[model samples]
Target: GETKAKAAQEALRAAREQATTPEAQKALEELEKVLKTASPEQWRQAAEKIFEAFREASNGNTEKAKKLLEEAARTAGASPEIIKKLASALERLAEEGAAKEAARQAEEVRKRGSLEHHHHHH
Candidate 1:
């Protein structure tokens, strides 16, 4: 059965697996360490770790995390939680990527409109 804490922990682990840079990996490792000794009060910290990873991925460089999730999806022996974490992250990242692209297109359209307006007035 699924639980929120378990979900958060699995997300942290999945993000750790997705980490590519040493800095990101170190961050994840730290999270893992906290989970290892985490008490009930420390669960919030655990949740933060998962949030940090997702935030970083959404901020810009999600390729590593995305790849890690895809790998997990394909790999054998993954627990249900692991599978769920990977799927959830991948879906969210994909959505974010699409949104970024749309925003970029909108910006270009705005710029083009401004240029056209200026040219017509000149």
Candidate 2:
């Protein structure tokens, strides 16, 4: 059980590194907080929540995903496999959002640059 706990802890740590959003960070923190005093049943509940969160995220239900993740974090138990799955889901969400954000920013910059260039020419 100790070994399993250690693995779950490590998996959570790795998940934190992959978490790029503020919501994700908060969720991970919550999980860490709960895991310290969680019982076996609590851990199972947490895992179920994590799994549901991932499903919500994959479906592009960002609000629900975040809510579920927070709920999971506030739950008692820890499972390395579930944490890993959560990490993977978070990674995908982060990457997907990051790409869109980056594109938006780049477009804004380009527009600004073009506007400036046009003004200079005028």
Candidate 3:
């Protein structure tokens, strides 16, 4: 699964580089560090998010762009494979209302598991 992503990221390296130089500015310095740290699959997620990040970073949206790339890349540094896929998945899921519902249910289930006091009286 991930081996293919390495090729995918290599493919996007150019697109990502273009944005890196002019708009990304100081970000490239970090991206250089980005490469040294993560694995192949981690690169793809950063690349994907960086591709998008630079776009936004260029078009007066650097705040979110930098944050996404920084946080996502940082996240990749910690648990990249999961964070990468989740980052991609979250973007799409955020659009669908079910995403919110699922997370809502997750918290509810988690809360019920921990604090066994307020049982639903239905």
Per-candidate Cα RMSD to the true structure, in Å, reads 17.3, 15.7, 16.1
Instruction: Point out the higher-scoring one by lDDT: 1 or 2.
Output: 2
Q: Which tens-of-lDDT digit does each residue in 58-106 have in candidate 3?
A: 4445455545655656745744543343233223322332222223323
After superposing candidate 2, which stretches have Cα over 4 Å from the reference? 1-14, 70-122
Q: Which lDDT values do the candidates have, in the order given?
A: 0.44, 0.51, 0.44
Per-residue lDDT value at 114 in model 1: 20
Tens digits of per-residue lDDT, candidate 2, 4-101, equal: 33334434443455454666655566556656677755665565555455445645665666566656755654455445544545556734653233
Alpha carbon lDDT at 11, candidate 3: 29
Q: How far off is residue 29 in model 1, in Å?
A: 0.6
- Report lDDT (Cα) of residue 42, candidate 3: 70
Query: What's the TM-score of every candidate structure?
Result: 0.37, 0.42, 0.44
Weakest lDDT window of 10 consecutive positions for candidate 1: 108-117
Span of ten consecutive residues with least summed lDDT in model 3: 93-102
Candidate that scores best on lDDT:
2
Clashes of 3: 0
74 Cα displacement, candidate 2 (Å): 6.3
Model number with the top TM-score: 3
What is the TM-score (0 to 1) of candidate 3?
A: 0.44
